[PDB]
Amino acid sequence: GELQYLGQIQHILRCGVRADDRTGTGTLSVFGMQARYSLRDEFPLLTTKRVFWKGVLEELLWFIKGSTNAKELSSKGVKIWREEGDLGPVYGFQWRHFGAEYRDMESDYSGQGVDQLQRVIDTIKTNPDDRRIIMCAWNPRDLPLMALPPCHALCQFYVVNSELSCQLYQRSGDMGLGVPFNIASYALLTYMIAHITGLKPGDFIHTLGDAHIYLNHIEPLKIQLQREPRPFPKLRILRKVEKIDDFKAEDFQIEGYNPHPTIKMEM
Amino acid sequence: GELQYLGQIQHILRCGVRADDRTGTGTLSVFGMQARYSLRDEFPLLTTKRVFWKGVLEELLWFIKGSTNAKELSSKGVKIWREEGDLGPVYGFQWRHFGAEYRDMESDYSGQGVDQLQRVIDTIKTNPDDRRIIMCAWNPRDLPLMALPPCHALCQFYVVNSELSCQLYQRSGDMGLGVPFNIASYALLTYMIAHITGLKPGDFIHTLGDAHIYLNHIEPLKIQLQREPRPFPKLRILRKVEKIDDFKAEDFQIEGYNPHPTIKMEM
């Protein structure tokens, strides 16, 4: 459960090596981590600090839309994320239009590129034993950088006994701010796809290459480490939904969430 | 150390779910595993059965060559792997000529495609902090299958304090026959690149999506589980080598390897 995340933070505090990110900002870093969160009658929204579940849910729905318009997200009461609001081919555009040439935020990308997300759902329905059920996302800043740049993250899905699991592998993870939010966002993506395909959620596994903590996050994380996890909440899906594009924020209700207080981490 | 591999095998024997591979052959399978092998003054050639180190070394040198000729490997006294011996764009061709159109085993691919392997080495020398140091390989059978198919495996390299680590992520791993051999092959690739770039080897991390054991391997693996690991050997590199293409089998010597006997596993 959440003790894995806390054990990992503790491990980086104890053994991480000082290393600077591309902007020069100090971090402590280790290489190679993995944790596994059960999705079975529970939902891994971490409880040692209040995670911004509304941001998680609204940003994932916005990825699913394939939107490249920052306005379409901020107006939902959420901050998180050459004209105004145009973000270029961000993660959601790649999920729905993989390989299409990006032009405009208000363009019509209908039937352009590979719809990786629909493909994952179609493969689970046509062959749930397939072990190539994988979707990938690139940091847009890498795309013009070199030929055939590598991906930044990949999700592999897996089905056994009518249960759907997901392993997210990211090449670099911010353990303080980004990981608890991503645990929740990919766990929620797994619940959505399992709902669509008639499966029950199984496990979300999160695997990192470089796992780092920003120097300015160390003192808050030391304090978060003294807090006792509470039992995870549940996620209910409130109606039958048939197509991944048809979900709305109102379809979801988190139950029994009882976190310790919000922790601010400098962005 | 090797107790991780043994604990993983035991875990699959105890909790793996029966699942058939694409040929129908029974396996036991779990999803999401990871292990970490130190490369620091030791080399993880497993000792609870004799691993075919000559096959490991000769096949890796053959990948590095970018060869698509089965003859060029078998003639080395090694079996492991529309004319005779032409294997098509196998893993090594992808490592050295990523994205080039494949024609013939005796063609001249000079300067065609991305040399992912050289790129990894060039990136370690120009920016060892980069966390995009990643090379990827596809099962050739997937290439004509669909547009933009997913990769079968990826290696991410990492440098801290003059030490080079590698994390291999494979979407599916055969725990009985393929994993001990791959631990050795990617560990050896990490020693070669660390030699070339003037770094010391750090850790090899091996992460799996679907991790499975073939039904016909269960009885031998139960017996391998009763065997006590011995201390790992060392790998010596016998001369100064400057370019990854310049290594030869004679440059390497395994020292202090003292395995339990060979275990045959049905292919």
Partner: peptide, 4 residues
């Protein structure tokens, strides 16, 4: 691995 490669240009999306």
């Amino acid at each position: 691995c490669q240009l999306y």
